Amino acid sequence: IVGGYTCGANTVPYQVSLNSGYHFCGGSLINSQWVVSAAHCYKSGIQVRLGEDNINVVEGNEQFISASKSIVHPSYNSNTLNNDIMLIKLKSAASLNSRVASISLPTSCASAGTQCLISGWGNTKSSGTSYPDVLKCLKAPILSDSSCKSAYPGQITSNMFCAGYLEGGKDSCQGDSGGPVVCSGKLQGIVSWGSGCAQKNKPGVYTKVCNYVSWIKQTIASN
């Protein structure tokens, strides 16, 4: 997260860290046994880390649970990043409390102008590299489809939306991939892609979760 603030320990209780020896992506806990992330975060051997703030220090509220199955969206296209969404089943149910909790799925899509919260452990600089150890947060609005398509001609599908600031300075960045975009208490987006981080006229692009609720629910109900 570039240009954000320190969330505060366990203030984003649905945020998870995907770990393969090191943090490599975020995700969101949608129930006691399932996490949703980006398909471009797929790899074998994932451990899901819940209840984290400092990812390099054991602080007492963590739960470390291995993944038992990963399901990449059937129509994911790695070249365009269309359908950039993945489900991860945990080997055992998480223990839900005030610091580890699930985030609701949306019943309706959020409209442009809605303010959302984006969070992650990604890079905090637009030029250079500095990775924080504690969770960072950014408040950002959903941008109009027109402004999003104008920023990225020929690249935005109906399964994507832009959020952030056209003037730059504030954005998600490398290492935030797969993490949540939460608006009015519902998961509306997944950190997907962009052109660099926090550059003028290049806002972040996010997977539009409201298009995938049926697939998510049917998949969880049969796996």
Ligand SMILES: [Ca+2]
């Ligand atoms: Ca920790």
